[model samples]
Target: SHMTNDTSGVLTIATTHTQARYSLPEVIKAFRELFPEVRLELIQGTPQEIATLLQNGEADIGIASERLSNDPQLVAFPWFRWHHSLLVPHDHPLTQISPLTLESIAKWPLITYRQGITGRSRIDDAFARKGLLADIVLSAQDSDVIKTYVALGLGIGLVAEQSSGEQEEENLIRLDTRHLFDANTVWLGLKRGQLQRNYVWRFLELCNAGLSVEDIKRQVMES
Candidate 1:
């Protein structure tokens, strides 16, 4: 009977703002096309909140940049990699800095993600290793919020690379920081020992082309 039945259940996903804004839209759209009966619920929060949701069985899938991979109660997979990019208000002095270095960027007040959200630690570590200290003037959880402040001339912005895509912003100019900062890998997490439904497998596969049901089952069993 199960084999002949169509999968019909809500697929709850807990994730951070960046992944929700930049990464999951296409995968989610395709998932709905494949499983029209399975409803989708996206629970957005900090990385820790996303992990907590999966731990409490409040979500079927969890996606985040930090904390999720290290949780012992969840089986994690590397979903994608991205780096931080710098943004400054048009005509800002940073635009004149060619071959931008950490020391050069540190000269200006910086606006970036708050602690424990997104990949803030990595940004800290990168600066520390270079013996440079970032003059982070303001910290926020959302890239759009960071951009808003940068637009107001609060400081230069350090944000996820995906946030600064091809969209033209009249007030902000994207500066290349790929060489200045280390890349971060976003992970997908599943609560360990939970039996994944057929649609759940499809959802994972949709998120990553290489993740099949067999691969997930093997990882779950071994983890």
Candidate 2:
């Protein structure tokens, strides 16, 4: 069933971003180079759908911010942790909050991830804990779209710091609001006990460096 030149299999990996793009393109590129014959179908999906994909064998793996960690049936490897930040247009009066406490980001109208994608619950959890309510003017899955609306004075953006890069965009100021919301762990998920190809294991190693294929196998099996 294997080819003479190389092995072949399709690994459908999903990311939370809508564009089917993972945070680390180099990892994806490396996987392609490591196994050119393997068909890597990179897709995007919601937190709930990520689990479904792995459970149904529709997807081989997925990366997410605070989504996969809550699921136990699947093996979700801890990838990284990050916080949600606020992006506000220049000279907004609320900017006077200087230190930018949780209360400061509230009541000024906001834009951020929808309930389905990313850790929107983390956003609410932070506000509710502080006894403050945010007037979220918009709910968008796309970070750029969230930034665009924020630029139009629609509302401030509350997004994962990693979701939108640190690059400074004109008419926008990205504020670090880690003090407000707790850090969310971005993890890699795989359905336990799936018989993966050799290449699939390599891709997992690429996502999490230093872990051998055998190491991943035990974690996948035991957890």
Candidate 3:
């Protein structure tokens, strides 16, 4: 399954929301550490947008938080899960609370993602099921922007677990919502029959420890 073309061609990666902000960049940094000779380009967008970019041949690989494997024209490899978490000011009242519930968050000014970008609908559905209505002070597509606003005491943010980091934020906190929200999976997509070069497969392997050109081709063939 090795590539026949030159290994120095640029590898374009289309990634969605949190991956764009957190995982992909970090992964690319790590990949460059190993394959410094290769050129890598990252294109950020929503999951749907990333899928579209891959479908249109605008990218060599697609990294997303949503599933697009069902598309007849694509090949997909699922890697890991990004658990949904809540970010609030440090030592906030919710931190002292045990077995936190969605209803508890409804009382505060909540910061959440925009619809169609992250899994905002899923959050909405959970709140709806619990009969909870939050005072959403901000709706953003970028996790960093959400964090910035939350740090300013604007609101508590609901973000992917990967975006959480220990930083100076006297008024910032991160809450785990695993008990209330479902974890979202991250996946890589490629056009089913498209031929990827060696560097492309190498980048994929760097991103996902379990994926390789043979592994991907075999799974698609078996399916």
Largest TM-score belongs to which candidate? 1
Question: Which pairs clash in the backbone of model 1?
Answer: none
Full-model lDDT for every candidate:
0.84, 0.75, 0.75
- The best candidate by lDDT is 1
Q: Write one digit per residue (lDDT tens) for candidate 3, span 134-195.
A: 68889887788888887887877888777763245556666778878776767788877777
Instruction: In candidate 3, list every pair of residues with a backbone clash.
Output: 86-175, 88-173, 89-172, 89-173, 90-172, 90-173
Question: Per-residue lDDT for 130-155 in model 1, tens only?
Answer: 88778988989889888888888788
Instruction: Encode model 2's per-residue lDDT on 1-223: one tens digit a residue.
Output: 3232386878788777732443668687877777778888866777787788878888888777645766666877766677787888767876677878877777688898888566788888998898866787898877878878887888888877765633568767777887778777777888876777777777777776856888788878774
* TM-score of predicted structure 1: 0.93
What local lDDT score does residue 184 receive in model 3, on the 0 to 100 scale? Answer: 71
Q: What is candidate 3's CA lDDT for residue 28? A: 77
lDDT of 2 at 28: 74
Name the lDDT of candidate 3: 0.75
Better of 1 and 2 by lDDT: 1
Q: Which stretches of candidate 3 lie above 4 Å from their native place? A: 1-6, 219-223
